[PDB]
Amino acid sequence: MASLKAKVLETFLAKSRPELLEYYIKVILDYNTAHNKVALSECYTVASVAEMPQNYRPHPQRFTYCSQVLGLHCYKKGIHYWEVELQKNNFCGVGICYGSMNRQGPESRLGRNSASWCVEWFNTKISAWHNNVEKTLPSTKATRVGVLLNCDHGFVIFFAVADKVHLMYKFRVDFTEALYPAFWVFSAGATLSICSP
Ligand SMILES: *CC(=O)N1CCCN(C(=O)c2ccc(-c3ccccc3)c(C)c2)CC1
């Protein structure tokens, strides 16, 4: 149903922030996945860089190579929106990934494998990543990203969220398994906050 999928994508690309909030889902960070450099706070809604490594209990799902963390729930059907506040001028990333993504080694890095899609702030520049292919984006003064995941018609949209929403990047994928919200923090004081609007 290519025509219907294209129309739906066009509709969501043009939605305002109030309209995106109609698809809001509450995302919670999953302690079992957090790398030891990722500190969690505020009832698991805030991820920040720990200056010293923590000593989290071993778990097969825990990231051991990249300082990343996933949401608690995955999505295989429906439409989902969530927003992440970021501290400005930091190395960090917001994305989505399949549960089957590796949790160990360089293959676990968001956007550097076939199983994940993200936008990333890296050396004050903004890029979109999937399958180890980088796309440079124009800078934004927004300190908030909105992720619109449409499982039913196969796309994810990353919005820069300010007084209005602006497109950062989108991907069309016929997703093959459920998706987790995914997060990367690296620079000192980098912080990703799942907002409650
Ligand atoms: C994916 C991840 O978080 N890792 C842990 C951190 C180090 N690492 C890197 O691959 C990595 C090396 C160098 C930089 C960097 C720092 C400052 C300027 C430019 C690049 C980064 C951001 C990551 C292994 C995996």
Author numbering: -1 to 195
From the paper:
TRIM25 is a member of the TRIM family of RING-type E3 ligases and comprises a canonical N-terminal tripartite motif (TRIM) and a variable C-terminal PRYSPRY substrate binding domain. TRIM25 has been reported to ubiquitinate a number of different substrates, possibly in some cases mediated through RNA binding, including RIG-I,15,17,18 DDX3X19 and ZAP,20–22 with diverse roles in immune regulation, cancer signalling pathways and antiviral activity. We sought to assess whether the E3 ligase TRIM25, reported to catalyse the formation of both Lys48- and Lys63-linked ubiquitin chains, could be liganded and repurposed for targeted protein ubiquitination. As the majority of current proximity-inducing small molecules for E3s recruit substrates to the physiological substrate binding component (e.g. the substrate adaptor of Cullin RING E3s),11 we focused our efforts towards liganding the PRYSPRY substrate binding domain of TRIM25.
A crystal structure of the TRIM25 PRYSPRY-compound 10 complex was solved at 1.8 Å resolution, which, to our knowledge, represents the first published structure of TRIM25 in complex with a small molecule. Analysis by intact protein LCMS revealed Cys498 as the site of covalent modification by compound 10. Multiple sequence alignment of all PRYSPRY-containing TRIM proteins showed that Cys498 is not conserved across the family (ESI†). Thus, the covalent targeting of Cys498 by compound 10 reveals a unique binding mode for TRIM25. The biphenyl ring system of 10 forms π-stacking interactions with the aromatic side chains of Phe523, Phe554, Trp616, and Phe618. Furthermore, the carbonyl of the Cys-linked acetamide bond of 10 acts as an H-bond acceptor for both the side chain hydroxyl and main chain –NH of Ser499, and the side chain indole amine of Trp616. The carbonyl of the diazepane amide linker also forms an H-bond interaction with the terminal guanidino group of Arg541. Interestingly, structural overlay of TRIM25 PRYSPRY-compound 10 with the PRYSPRY domains of TRIM7, TRIM21 and TRIM58, for which small molecule ligands have been reported, showed that the ligands all bind at the same site on the PRYSPRY surface, which has also been suggested to be a substrate binding interface (ESI†). The meta position on the pendant phenyl ring was determined to be both solvent accessible and synthetically tractable. Interestingly, the rate of TRIM25 auto-ubiquitination was significantly increased by compounds 10 and 11 (ESI†).
